[PDB]
């Protein structure tokens, strides 16, 4: 089997992407944030504290003839950005782009933190990291991909995120029309539960390539590119007037700037992030200070190849017995 679903930016900045997901019988379609940095499929629901729902579409398990309470199971998750959610668990039928999993754990939120409430466009998350990170207790549950994998034509999924435009998540096949040149594959460590890999270096604009190993995670659920302070300083030094602002919470730059590109290495291959992808717009409405899309990972504890980086590539998440990651230009 295969599946193919369009993923759509939630706003004009590509702050996140939503993908429609069918849950239950009859189907209830929710728009979920596909997150290769976590491993829980959780939804706003009829169980979510009413004051914490503000415009989201909810899953109502009592209206699904295939929903079953997973007795005694609870979940609770905290994300890198400080947000969180928790609740109980049902199993139900879940379909993405025509690919169906029966008995998928659907984690129903009883509580969500303010940032989730405040984002009316995201109805929940669909985790695509390794199932070892799943938070369900006392019986850990599998991701949608893990459950689907054996049925797929090939044990892979691909992320093809758009810049200010829709893109695609495919399951079970590689669309050879969706990228240019060849796909370069690189090793993955699953030791921390992430799609963790090592970039071979970087360049700023038309500058020379610096060969240096940068360990980090491919994370579709993180907006920005978080890299070591040395790398980030080298980038922003090429933008007149750019500075790190403790009050704003990272590098800012004059909105009048033209940003240089940023290149990262994948083996001997190179992925170029155009400068415009690095512009996250005014820090507050009407400001002439703009927020940068490349930020320091210092104090996160890990480098994160988030959407800024991934949307410059066609990315293969290869879930073979020994997982790997592939990157192609597009």
DSSP string, 221-253: T--SEEE-HHHHHHHHTTSTT-EEETTTTEEEE
> Is 160 part of the annotated catalytic residue set?
no
**Taking CA 143 as the corner, what is the angle to CA 137 and CA 145, rounded to the nearest 5 degrees?**
170
Domain boundary among 174, 209, 227: 174
Domain boundary among 174, 205, 237: 174
Alpha carbons 215 and 128: distance in angstroms, whole number: 19
Number of domains in the chain: 2
E-state strands within 129-257: 156-160, 167-171, 184-187, 196-204, 210-218, 225-227, 243-245, 250-254
The answer to whether residues 183 and 322 belong to one domain is yes
Candidates 118, 113, 95; CA nearest to 5 is: 95
Can you name the residues that pair with 6 across neighbouring β-strands?
168
The answer to whether residues 146 and 25 belong to one domain is yes
Q: Do residues 232 and 214 lie in contact, with contact meaning Cβ atoms separated by under 8 Å?
A: no
Burial 8-19 (b: 16+ CB within 10 A, else e): bbbeeebebbbb
- Count of alpha carbons within 13 angstroms of residue 176, beta-carbon side: 1
Alpha carbons 145 and 318: distance in angstroms, whole number: 11
Which tokens hold the place of 151? 């049925």
The answer to whether residues 114 and 208 belong to one domain is no
Reported resolution, Å: 1.2
The answer to whether residues 153 and 40 belong to one domain is yes
The answer to whether residues 41 and 56 belong to one domain is yes
The answer to whether residues 310 and 327 belong to one domain is yes
| CATH code at position 74 | 2.40.70.10
Q: Do residues 46 and 251 lie in contact, with contact meaning Cβ atoms separated by under 8 Å?
A: no
Which tokens hold the place of 47? 């169980």
Cα separations in angstroms, 325 against 150, 258, 267 = 19, 32, 11
**Taking CA 85 as the corner, what is the angle to CA 319 and CA 14, rounded to the nearest 5 degrees?**
65
The answer to whether residues 12 and 142 belong to one domain is yes
Domain boundary among 139, 174, 209: 174
The backbone torsions φ and ψ at residue 318, rounded to the nearest 5 degrees and listed phi first, read: -90, 110
Exposed / middle / buried, residue 127 (Cβ in 10 Å: 0-12, 13-18, 19+): buried
Which tokens hold the place of 12? 């004009």
Indicate if the alpha-carbon torsion angle 268, 272, 273, 275 is positive or negative: positive
The answer to whether residues 114 and 262 belong to one domain is no
The active-site residue out of 39, 199, 261, 297 is 199
How do beta strands 156-160 and 124-127 pair? Answer: unpaired
Can you name the residues that pair with 58 across neighbouring β-strands?
none
Candidates 251, 260, 323, 237; CA nearest to 294 is: 251
Can you name the residues that pair with 294 across neighbouring β-strands?
225
The answer to whether residues 329 and 190 belong to one domain is yes
Range of the domain at 16: 5-174
The answer to whether residues 111 and 63 belong to one domain is yes
The backbone torsions φ and ψ at residue 329, rounded to the nearest 5 degrees and listed phi first, read: -70, 165
The active-site residue out of 14, 33, 35, 40 is 35
The answer to whether residues 36 and 149 belong to one domain is yes
Cβ count near 286 (within 10 Å)? 6
Q: How many residues does the chain have?
A: 330
Residues contacting 86, CB < 8 A, separation 6+:
74, 75, 76, 77, 109, 110, 111
Q: What is the DSSP letter of 181?
A: S
> Is 35 part of the annotated catalytic residue set?
yes
Q: Do residues 31 and 20 lie in contact, with contact meaning Cβ atoms separated by under 8 Å?
A: yes
């Amino acid at each position: 089997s295969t599946g193919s679903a369009t993923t759509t930016p939630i706003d004009s900045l590509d702050d996140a992407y939503i993908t429609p997901v069918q849950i239950g019988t009859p189907a209830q379609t929710l728009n979920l944030d596909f997150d290769t940095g976590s491993s829980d499929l959780w939804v706003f629901s009829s169980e979510t504290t009413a004051s914490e729902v503000d415009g989201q579409t909810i899953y109502t398990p009592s209206k699904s003839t295939t929903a079953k309470l997973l007795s005694g199971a609870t979940w609770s998750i905290s994300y890198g950005d400080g947000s969180s959610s928790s609740g109980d668990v049902y199993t139900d039928t879940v379909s993405v782009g025509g690919l169906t999993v029966t008995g998928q754990a659907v984690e129903s939120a009883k509580k969500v933190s303010s940032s989730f409430t405040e984002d009316s466009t995201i109805d929940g998350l669909l985790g695509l990291a390794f199932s070892t990170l799943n938070t369900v207790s006392p019986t850990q549950q599998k991701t949608f991909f893990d459950n689907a994998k054996a049925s797929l034509d090939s044990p892979v999924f691909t992320a093809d995120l758009g810049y200010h435009a829709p893109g695609t998540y495919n399951f079970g096949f590689i669309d050879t029309t969706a990228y240019t040149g060849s796909i370069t594959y690189t090793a993955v460590s699953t030791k921390q539960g992430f799609w963790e890999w090592t970039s071979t270096g970087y360049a700023v604009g038309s500058g020379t390539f610096k060969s240096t190993s940068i360990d980090g995670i491919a994370d579709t659920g993180t907006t920005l590119l978080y890299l070591p302070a040395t790398v980030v300083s080298a980038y922003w030094a090429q933008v007149s007037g750019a500075k790190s602002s403790s009050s704003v919470g990272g590098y800012v730059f004059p909105c009048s700037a033209t940003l240089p590109s940023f290149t990262f290495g994948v083996g001997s291959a190179r992925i170029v992030i155009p400068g415009d992808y690095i512009d996250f717009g005014p820090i507050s409405t009407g400001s002439s200070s703009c927020f940068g899309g490349i930020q320091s990972s210092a104090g996160i504890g890990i480098n994160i190849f988030g959407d800024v980086a991934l949307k410059a590539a066609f990315v293969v998440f290869n879930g073979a017995t020994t997982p790997t990651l592939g990157f192609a230009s597009k």
